[PDB]
Design a protein around this ligand. Structure first.
Ligand code: ADP
Ligand code: ADP
Ligand code: ADP
Lengths: 712, 55, 247
């Protein structure tokens, strides 16, 4: 009782922890009350308690600063003891830690400690260590004297003193600038997967020493450079306390025969001596390249030594080996055999939300102006990875630094804290840096949750419900794991796949004709397996194969070369589908405009068992389509959307969109010409109607209706 | 009310920080369930049914 | 006060310094006036100020010859002061530097120094190094003795001597024929990008140590052979003064 398991914080503030309200009710303490936390080695800390909707009933959420003061780690247990007797302090003496005050001078109180404590009413205990961010530096301080003891609340009338040399850090204390879980932005799911596999044997080694069954021996992290492969490996070691050994291909390969293999096996011996430990091998493709690609003895023997060292892990208890590569198929396949590195995680590329989180992490120490909009930056930085967003923040800082330092002209060994305190980075400095930055991951496919929702699709009310039932039924109550859409082009086939992914918050993987053709043309259809493996790693996701017949058409379609309806890629797709279970949380959607010439195997039981026809929108749907397309623009009251829909009897949704964009373009041109009108008027739609035409003929509709009746 | 400084003076049992099989299995089960919940493909209606339980 | 950042000049002339007009009016330093520039090691240079529409208010634009004489480099800050009481000289003794006069002979004054000082009204100081071009050679000259001190204006009616052994170069000064930024023609935009990335980490190393930002670690220059990839690398190292190692 009165004890909770230590978990991660949501509020990064160093003076507060969050409990689930039922435990605050049992302890009869209110939001804002001051409590003591009892940790290991007879240590304690004082903090304020709040509550939220996410903390588990049996856990306490506290950040790294609080855990370090208690000398506890995630997964430990502490006691909560309210201390309402705490009073306000009269004088507190705070001095910085030497490890963070180097190259910087000036009045640290005025820049850091004063605004940090001013009207904050933070609890303080003698010996506490805390971090104050600012001036592009992270400076932490320790409390060395308190007039009240052993703790108090700082007040606006409390004297804050700071005179003396910086304090040297203790050997049992870690720097707050060391990478931890709070430094990782996107790829939260991948981090959780590592936690499940790694933290248990490191925090509770007794569970695995008592039994003959070993935990996973190696984890292969793959994805583009700069996505956090090494950051995760280090953060996990730093949070659990396991010794981290850094290895990389070039460091071993640069050595001569004998020295190379010796250094590799020596590191493994050190890990056992320092167990629990994690061995991280970067550039696995460099240390263990495929043997058929080299004739050197050094490269082959190093692979042999690594293979035996991985096998020896059954004796080196509590040592886990992790490795990083660009692709799981770029390394010697022997490492991926049962055991060794038979577990892998796809890190991928952060989406717009993850990129914003990464920027917010990098700017923690940066003073930003009110005009800076990091969300807008994250939306524009498509194809960037955390390594590029770090460069972006650095370049934006450097541009701001140059602008002021040219006028400050302070030439000395250290920089004044005051001049850094007044230095702010504006939107013009990020805009400049964006123009100079170039994404390192622009060639790889970016997979994220789409922004298309059901309100963006006109008509097809029954298809919307069908897709919602197909995904909801296996969750609320063999269910099908895929659907084929057929019908005229420009009716929303792709939008339907995106909208269901949107509402489910699922990743949308878009495969288009050119990609299916690229695999066929280059005889690289084996890449389909990687696409399906990505779908599993991206789960929950929707795996959308558009233009299924793009290859059959490229080979002739109505005429034909050496092939027919089946090809290299569709046969690989059929093969991979047979290996995917309904429990993989992947929904496969296909689309074609010519269902009569697609390999019918795709509709056979166990594959795309659902089959939905998408007709042209009817009158009420066409109005809904026009309203959806115009939902983002001012439209005059004289625009009669029902009149337009009545005329556009044979038009597809894509054709109605062209009409909307035509009227939009005309409204913009008129406004520009008048300045050198503020809303789209009927005259702009009536002009668009003179050029817009239906793209789907009546004969094409009969083709689809006959197919639908043939299959029922 | 007047707080009493004596309310803050308490010493924990030596076995306090030694977690049991139920406490360790519960945490590892929640770790596996948390990864599974992130993997689940579900509609907004199922998501709200769970979230709404705390209101 | 009166302390401005040293920048590059468009006018290659050795007797010309360009300042932005708002500072010329504030300091009463007007077009045609003679001004002194204060550099390192209690050294100074004398030149004529002109206005332009490209200099920033906080910068002074000068060429390599002036920066070498002041022992300053681009990006530093120097002091500026007018000296309207400068008078014309009477006798000027100039000698060539032996490092630049080799394999050639004849009357160096008539070819080089005479047209250099022919009705030019150039401001000189004792110890100044200046470059005179002609005959497909670039010959450096030093002012070694003058009647007025420490500086004067060289009028067309003065007597200029060019007799005696060539003067030796000192170890504290660099050759004016060494590769610099004025040797790079096209791709000026690329040079500007590199300068921003490289000059500050090297010119003010304490700034990157003092501020928590990571400097660039390496720049890859790519393009066809003969475009100036190796020319930029040398020009940057020579202008910043960093130790250069060639691989
Ligand atoms: N997912 C991420 N979240 C936060 N920061 C990231 C992420 N991915 C990369 N970074 C940042 O980019 C850099 C990665 O460089 P490095 O330490 O070599 O790791 P890696 O090359 O394995 O990604 C670090 O500055 C790190 O903070
Ligand atoms: N049912 C619909 N409702 C609203 N807009 C539609 C609809 N069908 C097509 N469109 C318009 O047509 C465009 C292309 O739709 P898309 O689904 O990409 O066609 P396809 O699936 O044939 O490639 C979209 O930008 C959209 O504006
Ligand atoms: N962009 C340029 N501007 C001026 N001169 C140039 C440029 N590019 C090349 N040169 C000249 O051409 C020659 C190039 O020779 P070298 O030093 O080998 O340079 P590179 O790296 O271009 O091969 C030099 O004489 C150099 O002055």
């Amino acid at each position: 009782p009165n004890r909770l398991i230590v978990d991660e914080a949501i509020n990064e503030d160093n003076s507060v922890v969050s409990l689930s309200q039922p435990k605050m009710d049992e302890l009869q303490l209110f939001r804002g009350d001051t409590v003591l936390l009892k940790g290991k080695k007879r240590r304690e800390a004082v903090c304020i308690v709040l509550s939220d909707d996410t903390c588990s009933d049996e856990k306490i959420r506290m950040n790294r600063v609080v855990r370090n003061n208690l000398r506890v780690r995630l997964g430990d247990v502490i006691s909560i003891q309210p201390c309402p007797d705490v009073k306000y302090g009269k004088r507190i003496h705070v001095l910085p830690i030497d490890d963070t005050v180097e190259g910087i001078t000036g009045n640290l109180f005025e820049v850091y400690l004063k605004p940090y404590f001013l009207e904050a009413y933070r609890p303080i205990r003698k010996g506490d260590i805390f971090l104050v961010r600012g001036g592009m530096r992270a400076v932490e301080f320790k409390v060395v004297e308190t007039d009240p003891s052993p703790y108090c609340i700082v007040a606006p009338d409390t004297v804050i003193h700071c005179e003396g040399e910086p304090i040297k850090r203790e050997d049992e204390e870690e720097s707050l600038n060391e990478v931890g879980y709070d430094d990782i932005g996107g790829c939260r799911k991948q981090l959780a997967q590592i936690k499940e596999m790694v933290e248990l044997p490191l925090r509770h080694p007794a569970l695995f020493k008592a039994i003959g069954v070993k935990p996973p021996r190696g984890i292969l992290l793959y994805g583009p450079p700069g996505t956090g492969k090494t950051l995760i490996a280090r953060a996990v070691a730093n949070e659990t306390g396991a010794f981290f050994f850094l290895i990389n291909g070039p460091e071993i390969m640069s050595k001569l025969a004998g020295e190379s293999e010796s250094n590799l096996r020596k590191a493994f011996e050190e890990a056992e001596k320092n167990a629990p430990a994690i061995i991280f091998i970067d550039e696995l493709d460099a240390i263990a390249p495929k043997r058929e690609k080299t004739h050197g003895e050094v490269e082959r023997r190093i692979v042999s030594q690594l293979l035996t060292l991985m096998d020896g892990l059954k004796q080196r208890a509590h040592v886990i080996v992790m490795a990083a590569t660009n692709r799981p198929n770029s390394i010697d396949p022997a490492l991926r055999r049962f055991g060794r590195f038979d577990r892998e995680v796809d890190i991928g590329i952060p989406d717009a939300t993850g990129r914003l989180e990464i920027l917010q992490i990098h700017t923690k120490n940066m003073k930003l102006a009110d005009d800076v909009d990091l969300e807008q930056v994250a939306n524009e930085t498509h194809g960037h990875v955390g390594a590029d967003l770090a460069a972006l923040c650095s370049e934006a800082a450097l541009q701001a630094i140059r602008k002021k330092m040219d006028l400050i002209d302070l030439e000395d060994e250290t920089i004044d804290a005051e001049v850094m305190n007044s230095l702010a980075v504006t939107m013009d400095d990020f805009r400049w840096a964006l123009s100079q930055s170039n994404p390192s991951a622009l060639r790889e496919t970016v997979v994220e949750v789409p922004q298309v929702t059901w309100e963006d699709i006109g008509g097809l009310e029954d298809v919307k419900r069908e897709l919602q039932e197909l995904v909801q039924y296996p969750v609320e109550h063999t269910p099908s794991k895929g659907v084929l859409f057929y019908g005229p082009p420009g009716c929303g086939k792709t939008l339907l796949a995106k909208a269901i992914a949107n509402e489910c918050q699922a990743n949308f993987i878009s495969i288009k004709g050119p990609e299916l053709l690229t695999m066929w043309f280059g005889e690289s259809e084996a890449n389909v397996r990687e696409i399906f493996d990505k779908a599993r790693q991206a789960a929950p996701c929707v795996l959308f194969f558009d233009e299924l017949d793009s290859i059959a058409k490229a080979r002739g379609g109505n005429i034909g070369d050496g092939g027919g309806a089946a090809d290299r890629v569709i046969n690989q797709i059929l093969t991979e589908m047979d290996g995917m279970s309904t429990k993989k949380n992947v929904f496969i959607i296909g689309a074609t405009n010519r269902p009569d010439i697609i390999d019918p195997a795709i509709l056979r039981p166990g594959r795309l068992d659902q089959l939905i026809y998408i007709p042209l929108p009817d009158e009420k749907s066409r109005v809904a389509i026009l309203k959806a397309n115009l939902r983002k623009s001012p439209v005059a009251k004289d625009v009669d959307l029902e009149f337009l829909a009545k005329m556009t009897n044979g038009f597809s949704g894509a054709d109605l969109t062209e009409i909307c964009q035509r009227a939009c373009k005309l409204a913009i041109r008129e406004s520009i010409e008048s300045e050198i009108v503020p809303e789209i008027r009927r005259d702009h739609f009536e002009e668009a109607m003179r050029f817009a035409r239906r793209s789907v003929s009546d004969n094409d509709i009969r083709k689809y209706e006959m197919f639908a009746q043939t299959l029922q | 009310f007047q707080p009493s400084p004596l309310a803050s003076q308490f010493e924990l049992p030596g076995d306090f920080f030694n977690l049991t099989a139920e406490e360790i299995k519960r945490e590892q089960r929640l770790r596996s369930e948390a990864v599974e919940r992130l993997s689940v493909l579900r509609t907004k209606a199922m998501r709200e049914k769970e979230e709404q339980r705390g209101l």
